[PDB]
């Protein structure tokens, strides 16, 4: 009756420190459709994150792309924080280049 | 163009 | 060569929080071009691709009317579904619909689709003949008897063979710069030791369109399906897609592994290996 989201955190282009880019969190394979997704910069929630229109795959499971502009550095740590009815506590996935 | 067909369950 | 148009409806009830949300999106292949959201400040069918913006006020008004009618119909359908499954009015439920047409290179109908789900499970589907139905359970059988009595399949067939294909052709022409352009993957192999005698080889494909792709690892020319970690194809956000495939190999055996890449934008399948 319920399916937990798969989560990928990644950049739009290959990361180069000091160069502008897009940070993406793609959540997929979940059901039902209510989901909470935050992009984190050093543990803190990035504001004005945008996301795609709700759609679903051939197996009826939903997917969403959350994204924001960012400029990666060597020190800064980025992550995606996802909550869903299937999750007892928020799952956090760290961005790994 | 979307379907104009009504589908009442 | 071949193309598809697909509309996706999500109708979600939410007891205590107003009327069910209705969200519709339209796609040509892997390119979204319209959206409707009943939760918007002013709900309307709205452009999501540059080549659809040229359509005039009659198009957008007609589509908006159709979407509001559809939203009403599917709110009612959620109410009906409650009765069909002996369910209470306290829970949240979801109806999903996906429908559309596939055409070949010459623009002729390859086949039509109209499939619906309730709470994530198959509910009822139009068969490939576009004249009969497959119901998943006894409730859906009720719906089926209704649609047979009303010859709904005939109307759907008329839409899929007529308007669906015609407008798909039109969209393919207006957006030919993008909808009829395949972007091949940019590919490479990375190598990361995990221990003194094992290493990960990861085969990357980036910036490709459409999303359909095949990435496989072979060891000594044999497919390593069972041993390959394959991530789900993911959108980059610029219309293109990304995917990788990883295999854990014994140190010193890296050259026995080859990555094979198949994509529409490639004249021939690619073979690549780790290049230290």
Numbering used by the authors:
A (entry chain B): 1 to 97
B (entry chain C): 1 to 9
C (entry chain A): 1 to 276
From the paper:
The human leucocyte antigen (HLA) molecules, encoded by the major histocompatibility complex (MHC) region of the genome, are cell surface glycoproteins responsible for the presentation of both endogenous and exogenously derived peptide antigens for immune surveillance. HLA-B*57:01, HLA-B*57:03 and HLA-B*58:01 are micropolymorphic HLA allotypes of the HLA-B17 serotype. Polymorphism within these allotypes is focussed on regions of the antigen-binding cleft (cleft polymorphisms in comparison to HLA-B*57:01: Asp114Asn and Ser116Tyr in HLA-B*57:03, and Met45Thr, Ala46Glu, Val97Arg and Val103Leu in HLA-B*58:01). Notably, residues 97, 114 and 116 contribute to the E pocket of the antigen-binding cleft, whilst residue 116 also contributes to the F pocket.
As a consequence of these substitutions the C, D, E and F pockets of HLA-B*57:01 were the deepest and most negatively charged of the three allomorphs. The depth and negative charge of the D and E pockets of HLA-B*57:01 accommodated the Arg and Lys residues at the PΩ-2 position of LTVQVARVW and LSSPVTKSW with the guanidino-head group of the Arg bound deeply within the E pocket, interacting with Asp114. For all allotypes mutation of the P7Lys to Gln had marginal impact on the Tm (<1 °C), although the P9Phe to Trp mutation showed a trend towards stabilising all complexes (+1.8–2.5 °C). Overall, these structures showed that the buried polymorphisms generated minimal differences to the surface of the HLA molecule available to TCRs whilst engendering marked differences in the peptide surface landscape available for T-cell interaction.
